Homo-oligomer: A and B are copies of this chain.
Amino acid sequence: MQLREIRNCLLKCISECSERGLVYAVRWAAEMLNGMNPIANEKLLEVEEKNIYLLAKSYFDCKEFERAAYTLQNCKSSKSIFLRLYSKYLAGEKKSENREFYYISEVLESLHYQGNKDPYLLYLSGVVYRKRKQDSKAIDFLKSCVLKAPFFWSAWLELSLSIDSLETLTTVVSQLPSTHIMTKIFYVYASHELHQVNSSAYEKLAEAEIIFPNSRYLKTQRALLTYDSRFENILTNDPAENLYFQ
């Protein structure tokens, strides 16, 4: 066998196993790949860190969050840094069930000061500030995240949870591209989550259904807005499920 053939076979294993949920085979292959003799700023850094990132993500997928974080201790790409902090955050929360929280906040603030604008890090800064009850800051980070990654649902959801009134909701929406379908979807979600649904929400929802006529998510939104106007029954689901928290 050629070295490059072995590498390629391990890499194809990783892909086929991760697609099928076989996280232990992925972890083993990633360990072996990393054990071989070694063979714009961000993209280069991601290529350089690719093997070590694969190993850290395999641990993360086995729920080894401490080990994933430690694996990434030397890495510098924004992708690596995100997984490292998100690992630390989940490992701190596993153990709560958060000693790591202040640490994560400081790393994120240094990153901001340095001028990092990676949308996944901006999302974690958002989550951190919301949890510190710093809502104005949370909103400003999450808006910056969804401007860059408008199809990233979890940022829009955290944005909605950072917003405490329809007035604040209309202020934020006034700063987002009003034509963009995700802005429309967010508006519907956040109006319902605030329980302040007017006519515009129904209009926006009808627009989103033209593009996604059979979405389980939008069907739920429609059922919720229908209850708002006042087999499965949406009222008998856990509301955490209907709100997409679970």
Residues of B within 8 A of A214 (CB): 34-36
Q: Does A230 contact B (CB under 8 A)?
A: no
Asked whether, in the complex, the Cβ of B149 is within 8 Å of the Cβ of A31, the reply is: no
Q: In whole Å, how far is A190's beta carbon from the nearest beta carbon of chain B? A: 15
- A201-234 contact mask (Cβ, 8 Å, vs B): 1 or 0: 0000000000111111110000000000000000
Partner of A83, one of B20, B34, B152: B20
State how many copies of this chain the complex holds: 2
The stretch of A3-11, A96-104, A134-142, A166-174 in contact with B is A3-11
- A151-193 contact mask (Cβ, 8 Å, vs B): 1 or 0: 1111000000000000000000000000011000000000000
Asked whether, in the complex, the Cβ of B153 is within 8 Å of the Cβ of A21, the reply is: no
Asked whether, in the complex, the Cβ of B36 is within 8 Å of the Cβ of A212, the reply is: yes
Q: With A21-B83, A83-B20 in contact, do A32 and B212 touch (Cβ < 8 Å)? A: yes
Residues of B within 8 A of A61 (CB): 21
Q: In whole Å, how far is A1's beta carbon from the nearest beta carbon of chain B? A: 7
Q: In whole Å, how far is A100's beta carbon from the nearest beta carbon of chain B? A: 16
Report the Cα distance A218→B32, complex, angstroms: 8
Q: What would 12 A/B residue contacts be, using CB atoms closer than 8 Å?
A: A1-B180, A6-B181, A16-B120, A16-B149, A17-B154, A21-B57, A21-B60, A22-B154, A24-B154, A28-B244, A35-B215, A36-B214
